[PDB]
Write a protein that binds this ligand. Structure first.
Ligand code: HEM
Ligand SMILES: [Br-]
Ligand SMILES: [Br-]
Length: 399
């Protein structure tokens, strides 16, 4: 059995193994960092099954859960939030924050999202690249999602910057153990102080809603509130920052499409839809442990055995998407849902907000910087480690 996570075939492409398995062994076994085995599902049909089957659980204290890192097995000891729950507890809690992320609710956020992108793009232009190129990630890819989720949570304008920086240090690969620890701690303390503040006088933010509708009525306690808020911050922020950086880099790999998009921003929506399918920056989140024996494909997954369904592979399933490995912004979509945001009950709570942020970036970035280009050869781009989720650490540019 091979070691999983597999390594990306190259900086921007998914693991070469996937296509192989999809053709020969759609459901196979893999070895996890701690020696334990888990079942790896690669076909779209089979991935959808896993993400919706009621015979599978997300509870991490249940033995056999497919943890992929040392920090994971340790983060499984803490009181679980809805991301780690099953029915009925899962929706019972998810429903406490869902209101903010509905299609309608997100539509109304648009002007705010636009003002956010517009403002950062200007702080950038005003910064200029006179003496050389600047990191698009630090100046743009990072602040955009960070400022929005923090603002939605309840962080006042003046604090967005420092906290945006703390959350970054938190997941930076070059950060030392103590550096990452202090940042994580700092975030939790701040969130804890916010809850103490919104309990006294509530405002218009997610933390105030939990405080007012859950903490006070006794449905959850202070710590529960802080952990839910923390979840919303860490569950999609690094992915957003990556989708943005990968988006700019993808447009520089296909000047053709970059034209068609600069020529018609109203295409952003379907471009983002192709970015989210092509670049699955979150491919290790659909994991389960069998609650009982279940059959997937030609294999029998016995109770309490772990399962990992790759949505990155499923998004390249040639049996659903024609020419899966070709980035087609004008792509003719099939009837099956691409899995960039998962599937089933657990489908990303912020799917509409993510798409709204992406559509607003790629429908405004080149229109404010049409002479914007990546200041490094396409083969010297600093992608994330080959063995981790696809993304980009730093992206120098000129405009
Ligand atoms: C483009 C960026 C994003 C991508 C591609 C992404 C993708 C995903 C994926 C693959 C999952 C797994 C869903 C499943 O169980 O099948 C997920 C879950 C989740 N995401 Fe996102 N996400 C992104 C942005 C966000 C943002 C902005 C937030 C923060 C508000 C967020 C918060 C969460 C939460 C809380 C869950 C757990 C939902 C549940 O289990 O009920 N995501 N996301
Ligand atoms: Br951040
Ligand atoms: Br995933």
């Amino acid at each position: 059995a091979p070691s999983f996570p597999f390594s990306r075939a190259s900086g921007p492409e998914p693991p070469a193994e996937f296509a192989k398995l999809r053709a020969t062994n759609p459901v196979s076994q893999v070895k996890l960092f701690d020696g334990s085995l888990a079942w790896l599902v690669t076909k779209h049909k089979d991935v959808c099954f896993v993400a919706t089957s009621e015979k599978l659980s997300k509870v991490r204290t249940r033995q056999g859960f497919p943890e992929l890192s040392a920090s994971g097995k340790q983060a499984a000891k803490a009181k679980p939030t809805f991301v780690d729950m099953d029915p009925p507890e899962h929706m019972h809690q998810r429903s406490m924050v869902e209101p903010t992320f509905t299609p309608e609710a997100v539509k109304n956020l648009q002007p705010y999202i636009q003002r956010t992108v517009d403002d950062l793009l200007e702080q950038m232009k005003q910064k200029g690249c006179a003496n050389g190129p600047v990191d698009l990630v630090k100046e743009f890819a990072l602040p955009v999602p960070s400022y929005i989720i923090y603002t939605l949570l309840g962080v006042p304008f003046n604090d967005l910057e420092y906290l945006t920086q703390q959350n970054a240090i938190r997941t930076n690969g070059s950060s030392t153990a103590r550096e990452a620890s202090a940042a994580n701690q700092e975030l939790l303390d701040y969130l804890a102080i916010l809850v103490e503040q919104r309990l006294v006088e509530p405002k218009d933010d997610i933390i105030s809603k939990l405080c007012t509708e859950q903490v006070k009525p006794g449905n959850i306690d202070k710590s529960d509130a802080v952990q839910i808020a923390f979840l919303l911050l860490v569950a999609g922020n690094a992915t957003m920052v990556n989708m943005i950086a990968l988006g700019v880099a993808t447009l520089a790999q296909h000047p053709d499409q970059l034209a068609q998009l600069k020529a018609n921003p109203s295409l952003a929506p379907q471009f983002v839809e192709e970015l989210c399918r092509y670049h699955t920056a979150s491919a290790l989140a659909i994991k389960r442990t069998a609650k009982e024996d279940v059959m997937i494909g030609d294999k029998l997954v016995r109770a309490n055995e772990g399962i990992i369904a790759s949505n990155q592979s499923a998004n390249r399933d040639e049996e659903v998407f024609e020419n899966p490995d070709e980035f087609n912004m004008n792509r003719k979509w099939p009837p099956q849902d691409p899995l960039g945001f998962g599937f089933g009950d657990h489908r990303c709570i912020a799917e509409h907000l993510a798409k709204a942020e992406l559509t607003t970036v790629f429908s405004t970035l080149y229109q404010k910087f049409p002479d914007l280009k990546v200041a490094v050869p396409l083969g010297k781009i600093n992608y994330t480690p080959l063995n981790r989720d696809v993304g980009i650490v730093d992206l120098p540019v000129i405009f």
